[PDB]
Amino acid sequence: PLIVPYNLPLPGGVVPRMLITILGTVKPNANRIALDFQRGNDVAFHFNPRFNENNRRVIVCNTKLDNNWGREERQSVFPFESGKPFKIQVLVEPDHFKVAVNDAHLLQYNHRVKKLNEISKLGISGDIDLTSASYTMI
């Protein structure tokens, strides 16, 4: 597989119709997963499943600009389970990232960072065995 944390270059950043696919398996007794779509030091799209925040499972999304986190967007639908294989698909659409897990739509996150073609790396981290991470234009 791949060594976590893993950096996936996104050559020429992202653009609508670009689909990024992350395949792995959650470790037993997981605490967190994180995808970080970065524009340089900024994080355009942070997607952060938390397995135990006050004994609740929640996905936190956010953007970091000039080292400051913005307003979190939170989703209680939580498709991940400790120990189980998952697929995350992030499809760039004109106004948002659209995320589906295991072929089921999960959430969308409106673009706050506008220079899509400068979001040139995806960091993948957390309590997973990572199998593959790739992109394709659809």
Ligand SMILES: NC(=O)[C@@H]1O[C@H](CO)[C@@H](O)[C@H](O)[C@@H]1S[C@@H]1O[C@H](CO)[C@H](O)[C@H](O)[C@H]1O
């Ligand atoms: N920025 C913080 O330190 C906030 O701390 C609060 C109390 O622990 C939490 O309720 C907030 O979610 C964040 S934690 C911080 O969140 C950002 C996303 O907004 C990112 O997930 C960071 O890795 C995490 O430390």
Ligand SMILES: [Mg+2]
């Ligand atoms: Mg279409």
Ligand SMILES: [Mg+2]
């Ligand atoms: Mg923000």
Ligand SMILES: [Mg+2]
């Ligand atoms: Mg911008």
